[PDB]
Design an enzyme around this catalytic site. Structure first.
Site, PDB file in Angstrom:
ATOM      1  N   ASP A   5       0.934  -1.151  -0.030  1.00 27.01           N
ATOM      2  CA  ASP A   5      -0.044   0.063  -0.084  1.00 27.01           C
ATOM      3  C   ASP A   5       0.828   1.515  -0.177  1.00 27.01           C
ATOM      4  O   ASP A   5       1.331   1.547   1.029  1.00 27.01           O
ATOM      5  CB  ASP A   5      -0.878  -0.132   1.197  1.00 27.01           C
ATOM      6  CG  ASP A   5      -1.756   1.539   1.192  1.00 27.01           C
ATOM      7  OD1 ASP A   5      -1.889   2.124   0.165  1.00 27.01           O
ATOM      8  OD2 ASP A   5      -1.956   1.949   2.277  1.00 27.01           O
ATOM      9  N   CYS A  61     -12.921  -0.694  19.358  1.00 23.52           N
ATOM     10  CA  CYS A  61     -12.371   0.176  20.452  1.00 23.52           C
ATOM     11  C   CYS A  61     -12.792   1.712  19.594  1.00 23.52           C
ATOM     12  O   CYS A  61     -12.104   1.830  18.629  1.00 23.52           O
ATOM     13  CB  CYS A  61     -11.166  -0.099  20.849  1.00 23.52           C
ATOM     14  SG  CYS A  61     -10.160  -0.655  19.572  1.00 23.52           S
TER      15      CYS A  61
HETATM   16  N1  LIG Z   1     -11.973  -2.517  15.728  1.00 26.53           N
HETATM   17  C1  LIG Z   1     -11.300  -1.242  15.495  1.00 26.53           C
HETATM   18  N2  LIG Z   1     -11.733  -0.349  16.564  1.00 26.53           N
HETATM   19  C2  LIG Z   1     -11.400   0.953  16.399  1.00 26.53           C
HETATM   20  N3  LIG Z   1     -10.636   1.377  15.342  1.00 26.53           N
HETATM   21  C3  LIG Z   1     -10.175   0.560  14.330  1.00 26.53           C
HETATM   22  C4  LIG Z   1     -10.724  -0.796  14.532  1.00 26.53           C
HETATM   23  N4  LIG Z   1     -10.018  -1.582  13.183  1.00 26.53           N
HETATM   24  C5  LIG Z   1      -9.482  -0.579  12.748  1.00 26.53           C
HETATM   25  N5  LIG Z   1      -9.414   0.395  13.247  1.00 26.53           N
HETATM   26  C6  LIG Z   1      -9.401   1.964  12.667  1.00 26.53           C
HETATM   27  O1  LIG Z   1     -10.127   2.032  11.519  1.00 26.53           O
HETATM   28  C7  LIG Z   1      -9.307   2.595  10.429  1.00 26.53           C
HETATM   29  C8  LIG Z   1      -9.165   1.588   9.199  1.00 26.53           C
HETATM   30  O2  LIG Z   1      -8.489   0.597   9.771  1.00 26.53           O
HETATM   31  P1  LIG Z   1      -7.012   0.115   8.707  1.00 26.53           P
HETATM   32  O3  LIG Z   1      -6.711  -1.138   9.429  1.00 26.53           O
HETATM   33  O4  LIG Z   1      -6.320   1.075   8.125  1.00 26.53           O
HETATM   34  O5  LIG Z   1      -7.912  -0.510   7.407  1.00 26.53           O
HETATM   35  P2  LIG Z   1      -7.556  -1.571   6.098  1.00 26.53           P
HETATM   36  O6  LIG Z   1      -5.970  -1.650   6.169  1.00 26.53           O
HETATM   37  O7  LIG Z   1      -8.337  -2.577   5.771  1.00 26.53           O
HETATM   38  O8  LIG Z   1      -7.575  -0.151   4.865  1.00 26.53           O
HETATM   39  C9  LIG Z   1      -8.151   2.947  11.222  1.00 26.53           C
HETATM   40  O9  LIG Z   1      -8.143   4.220  11.118  1.00 26.53           O
HETATM   41  C10 LIG Z   1      -7.772   2.049  12.316  1.00 26.53           C
HETATM   42  O10 LIG Z   1      -6.950   2.580  13.315  1.00 26.53           O
HETATM   43 MG   LIG Z   2      -4.180  -0.938   5.360  1.00 21.33          MG
END
Ligand SMILES: Nc1ncnc2c1ncn2[C@@H]1O[C@H](COP(=O)(O)OP(=O)(O)O)[C@@H](O)[C@H]1O
Ligand SMILES: [Mg+2]
Ligand SMILES: Nc1ncnc2c1ncn2[C@@H]1O[C@H](COP(=O)(O)OP(=O)(O)O)[C@@H](O)[C@H]1O
Ligand SMILES: [Mg+2]
Ligand SMILES: [Zn+2]
Lengths: 30, 287, 280
Positions: free
Chosen positions: B54, B252
């Site tokens: 990414d 969370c």
């Molecule tokens: N279960 C959760 N509770 C709170 N915040 C979360 C949770 N899972 C992911 N996040 C937040 O949600 C957003 C998207 O998560 P991310 O891991 O970047 O997703 P992806 O990699 O699939 O794009 C981020 O800002 C991350 O910190």
């Molecule tokens: Mg990601």
């Protein structure tokens, strides 16, 4: 052989997929 | 009835390759983390390595600590490193990968210390995966070209097949490699996510795990309302995944990074969080 | 102090090209919609067109109605259609390029023609970076100094560059929400754009809260700690706050009745009744 069991479950899923009809499963889900 | 966790895998010993993805801002980035965390912890004699394609440089970001063109041991551990980096089909995809191989082995050799299990973060653009089929559709016309000639084009094709078979044989063993995917409780997730699975099987790739995320557990109005959304959905899944590691996971409040916050999260990739019990631990990363 | 809406734009007359994106499942897909809606409504003598490259076939999906290889007038309106060398920039352009033609086919062979066109930059971001790319190829054509291709590229880009480079036919809304990874990453977006000398005047923040449940209000603060961040550093921007109706929201019905708030930027207290309407 706890692991194997996992393989069987995966395989069972495949039979379900080969057996199941993804095109048909997709249709009902849709 | 199988297990909701990835504990079972947090401790694979023969998994030198894990692929994580999930078409969506479903959050699998943190996924890609909270996994490459639970591993080293519980196999610390394993130099592990988690990397991402990414462009966004999401990792470090999600880490509040910068990473780059070369393997860098996390700051806080000693075994979990991190590293941000012909018109035909499959093509690009592979090479893309390919170069990686080498670019990685450089980094272990030139490093000295070597890596044990490696954890991926399929581009938000999904996966270059495509290419497994490669040498098949390439088998038919290899013989066509053969029948006519009866050298470079043949060369490259055989090389690709070779590589894929070697990578594929290790790769197309459910024991060194398999494929968790993250995806949440909503139409576009599901379907789309579901789709994912198909192409994978379409690559004959073992895959046994599902991470659903940003769940609710309202036990505000729209909340509980919204909640039902998810629920109408969770089930959907459960029903059609008996044989799966369908891992429910809680949500969370707001940003969650800092190796601190992160570790203390991923625990729930083991003891699949329970609202009622483990409910205290939650608001801990909500500040 | 400028405006929170895109009203001002919902009614541009000289915009024949709008680019929308937002690295993230921040939701810009619906964005791409709620915009290509507010336009036709308020310019119905304008055959508009909204398309996507997101393989996912998200549009139709987000529409509960299928679309494909060719322009199809929405079902419910009569003016808003929808349609689903190793060097840099390269692929990206062509990618586009072919589109041009593939599109003009669809207006000509159609007969009826389109007025304003609305994009949905791949979740993979944007492949439109090549424009930045031609100027480089120019310096080194001279360094080296084949002519055909080079002039063609320049041509295309100029048709493409002008056109796009005039802030009046084309400009660039982006979607992105109230969270570190959004912000930063989104912010980034902007840079590359400027880096392409591309006008861009608008920000859609999404899935906001307005808790006026514990974790709710808590969470709320997240967003807030953030909204501001933005406001401060967007003196001059259409930083459009937007609210979050519970769960799935599609069906041209639900949608339209949503996008209104891209005009009258929704207000919790007042327009708060209208919300739970798409929450069922
Ligand atoms: N279960 C959760 N509770 C709170 N915040 C979360 C949770 N899972 C992911 N996040 C937040 O949600 C957003 C998207 O998560 P991310 O891991 O970047 O997703 P992806 O990699 O699939 O794009 C981020 O800002 C991350 O910190
Ligand atoms: Mg990601
Ligand atoms: N303000 C909102 N309130 C409720 N659901 C929303 C809102 N904005 C987007 N969605 C939903 O959130 C998810 C992601 O939005 P989507 O438009 O697909 O985003 P993107 O196109 O950026 O991937 C979809 O399931 C969509 O229905
Ligand atoms: Mg989209
Ligand atoms: Zn709430």
């Amino acid at each position: 052989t706890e692991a194997e069991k996992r393989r069987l479950l995966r395989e069972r899923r495949q039979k379900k997929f080969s057996n199941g009809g993804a095109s048909s499963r997709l249709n009902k889900i849709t | 009835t199988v297990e909701p966790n990835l504990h079972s895998l947090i401790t694979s010993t023969t998994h030198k390759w894990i692929f994580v993805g999930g078409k969506g801002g479903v959050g699998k980035t943190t996924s890609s983390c909270s996994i490459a965390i639970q591993m080293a912890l519980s196999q610390p004699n394993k130099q592990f390595l988690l990397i991402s394609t990414d462009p966004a440089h999401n990792l470090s970001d999600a880490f509040g600590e910068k990473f780059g063109k070369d393997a860098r041991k996390v700051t806080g551990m000693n075994n979990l490193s991190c590293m941000e980096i012909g018109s035909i089909p499959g093509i690009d995809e592979a090479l893309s990968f390919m170069e990686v191989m080498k670019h990685i082995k450089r980094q272990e050799q030139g490093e000295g210390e070597t890596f044990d299990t490696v954890i991926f973060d399929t581009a938000p653009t999904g996966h270059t995966l495509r290419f497994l089929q490669l040498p098949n559709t390439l088998s038919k016309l290899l013989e066509k070209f053969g029948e006519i000639t009866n050298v470079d084009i043949s060369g490259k094709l055989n090389e690709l097949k070779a590589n894929v078979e070697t990578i594929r044989q290790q790769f197309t063993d459910p024991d060194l490699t398999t494929f968790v995917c993250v995806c949440i409780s909503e139409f576009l997730s599901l379907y789309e996510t579901e789709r994912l699975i198909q192409e994978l099987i379409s690559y004959d790739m073992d895959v046994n795990s599902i991470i659903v995320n940003q769940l609710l557990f309202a036990e505000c109005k729209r909340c509980q309302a919204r909640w039902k959304m998810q629920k109408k959905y969770l089930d959907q899944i459960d029903e059609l995944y008996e044989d799966f590691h369908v891992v429910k996971m809680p949500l969370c409040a707001g940003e969650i990074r800092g190796l601190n916050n992160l570790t203390k999260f991923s625990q729930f990739l083991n003891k699949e969080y329970n609202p009622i019990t483990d409910g205290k631990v939650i608001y801990e990363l909500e500040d």
